[model samples]
Target: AQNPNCNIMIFHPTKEEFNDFDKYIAYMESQGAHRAGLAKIIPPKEWKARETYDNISEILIATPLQQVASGRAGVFTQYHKKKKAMTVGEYRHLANSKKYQTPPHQNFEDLERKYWKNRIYNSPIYGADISGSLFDENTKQWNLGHLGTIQDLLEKECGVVIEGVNTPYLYFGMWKTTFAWHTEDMDLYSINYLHLGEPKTWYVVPPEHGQRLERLARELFPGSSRGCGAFLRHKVALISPTVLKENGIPFNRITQEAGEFMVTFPYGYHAGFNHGFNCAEAINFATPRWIDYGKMASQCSCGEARVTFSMDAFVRILQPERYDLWKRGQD
Candidate 1:
């Protein structure tokens, strides 16, 4: 599935690109007809090397983020004590609109479960979120401007696209946490980055055939956990869209050297983990650009969602030429 042309595509959605959520959801529902789920397969050797960091063992997660979390107020939002309670704009116009305290509508009242308030809703106004942190910074300040020299080059020189919105705003305490691997809301293509610590991301071999993996997982772990973990044991993988798609590319999935850039395909089946005890950190980037893979997947699986179609008619509305330089190689 290696197509050089689509490798460095950048897609940004405008309000016009998606006027209503019905279309996106409808597509997902249709995909459901085909199926959705991750299979607990052992990584095909290449991705096994991503485990462990500085003697620390990693936890792998077979990520298959299903279910489009719908709703206005959304499912959950964490907060901190020092944060404001109401929408800043409404608070500013308190005297004029008499909406002094809008009753904790947009902003959070306090940080609970040890995380600051972030992400109120996720829908038409916003399809999905891409954000996170690195374990080194104590202030808990997430800044892309300070991502690192390699990251800077990946984005600035190599054309690796990134943004603060696609990162973690609050710290998850660097311990045991669950990141259910799900697809992008708007059929997005991206890669989740792990900057600090050694967390294992479970990248399951997608059940190429619809409903096959789900049935397979059901047999393996009857009434077990959902997603890939629900079926197979975990394994850390070094993910690099660039390396995986390149011909004769030797890969353990990890960039091997630190400060490396990575890419995840639009429907690529993969996951990750972090072993940063005190404060593990990382940033995730979503790109429509990734070397389109061909028949060769030395380490690939087919998730029912990987259906092929006429992308030939696809015209990248976002800046393509600018993104291509970064896609070929991270600067």
Candidate 2:
């Protein structure tokens, strides 16, 4: 009925939205933003906010920053350094503080993040453990509430309509920092995508861009290449972003319908990296064939694998021998 397959593309307004990156950055945070953390023990952000950007331009920061990856020296560091969970009031009080009331103050760590960005765009894109199990399959990790409403608004702005089977995706994310370039996983045949943000460092070569990413990663920072990509399900990522060396690239759109989408193909691997800022996210994982989806096989009583980031990989790995057990009536 309406188009929900729109967001993977970047949205650029003709004018600069944030006066200075910091204020805009604060605004991004004040809007309950944070990405997946890198610390081995950091927990994922599990709450939601009633405030949506369309309702309030000056968004009230509801949730404290959730760290997807560590090494971040964000706002909470100065005041509530320990990061004990805050009640709604505590969050509001801290947020309405003089520090943020003016602009943001960058302490030593904040500068450290900036330095790394300049010294090494080579900053590793933080990855997280799989997360889909937290919710039901029908529920999307990133709740694009009122899809029909979003479609109506976009249409008023003359937005484009795209669609397909976009079957369970191998990779996807939201609220990303920058579209850092990396190659797509070779297994799938997904073509390139179209970028619509401020141009950044995207290294474009011929054929599968994924290979080039692998090559560059090996040359630039060898040993840690394994940390390159992460499984994406749903949660508009706010950090650990991925960008293409080529600016304004468009993914191939074989078919488009009002509300349908397609994320399945051979080269469906994702390669975007993140800036050092914090963010929030929702990700999904695939069901593994080997791991019995039967009773004990499930993380819950339902015999279902939790929908999460490891959706494809775990499914593929745990069920390596049974990769295609379910072809939907194939028997």
Candidate 3:
């Protein structure tokens, strides 16, 4: 049975509403969209699209084999096994090919087991930094670069480009290729825009339910949780919504389509799988209000993995007048 709370909020913004990115996001937040951890935004019809990665073809893709024998839905990459290298065009051809098919099954468990076992290569191109290149001709608008709320607070004030955080990263996904449950680096907000291709299914837990999710994860994976509280950052675990519901964790689901955007809130834990071959661009951003979240994350005992960008440096780099005002407010 599906959880009633699984439905996330979706916004169909008009051209005028979407043109002012920060204002639109603030309006959504005001409508309590953050309570769902993730919200989908359907852009105006007038927004034209373009192909960004046509020039770059070769990409190293991770092939994660499902560990179905263990009676779990988790997948793992053989450390010693070499990653498959292929051109984007060739990968697309293989992804759309009839190499794999859904197995006939009597139950969800059976289907999952058979499907994972039968699936050959679940290769996904992840963390490909594409900040230096233009995603579209209209970088100021189409690319979520200067339009984000953090543009003034983080980018303009600090004047540093942190790849995959402030700057963007491109992701190429195919059937069952997954991104495991985890919060954004430094607990900052993240926005992902699907440039083209098939939809992606996202499962997210609200920040209020973050602790319960962690407890459930620890209970489920005792070995991994023993030393590291932030073991989820490893991106290896895959817990189904059924399992999460059974454990009494609140979560929501969203299907992100092409030309749509998915915004993940601060301290929100999320995981997802691609429905088919798709291309998406994502970047992390922080508003002035995110300073508290960032500070909290910096103080966490989760170790080095928790620290992607330097919080102290960010504060230090702010203009003297702004820094003084910020410090005074903190005091």
Q: Write model 1 residue lDDT over 1-331, tens digit each, in one string.
A: 3221222222222334323322432333233311222211111222212333343222211121211222122122111113223322222233123221112232221211111112222110100121233333332222232333323323554464543233333222122222333333222333333333323333332323313333433443343334333222222112222323342222122211122223333334443322222223333332212223211211111221221121211212133442343222222
TM-score of each: 0.28, 0.28, 0.74
Tens-digit lDDT string for candidate 3 (1-331):
2223535788889877867777777887778787788889887877654545566456544442332223344333211233455556666776677753233467544544443453334343332333432356464454665545443466554566533235666776666666778887657799899877777778899876788888888888787788565677655566777678787888877678888989998888998766667778888877765666665552223442333344435544433334454344334
Error of 3 at 199 (Å): 1.3
For residues 1-331, could you state the per-residue lDDT of candidate 2 as single tens digits? 1112211222121124412322432342233221110001111234122222132123223223332323232100011112344333343344344422212326533432452343222222222321211113343322322112212322233343322112221111112223323222212222221111111112122222334434443443332334323211112221221222233232221211111211222222233322222222221211111123211121111222124232333334334444455212122
TM-score of candidate 1 relative to the true fold: 0.28
The predicted structure with the larger lDDT, 1 or 3, is 3
Give the winner by lDDT: 3
- Indicate the worst ten consecutive residues by lDDT in candidate 2: 34-43
Q: Give lDDT: candidate 1, residue 58.
A: 28
Report RMSD (Å) for each prediction in the order shown: 20.0, 16.7, 7.1
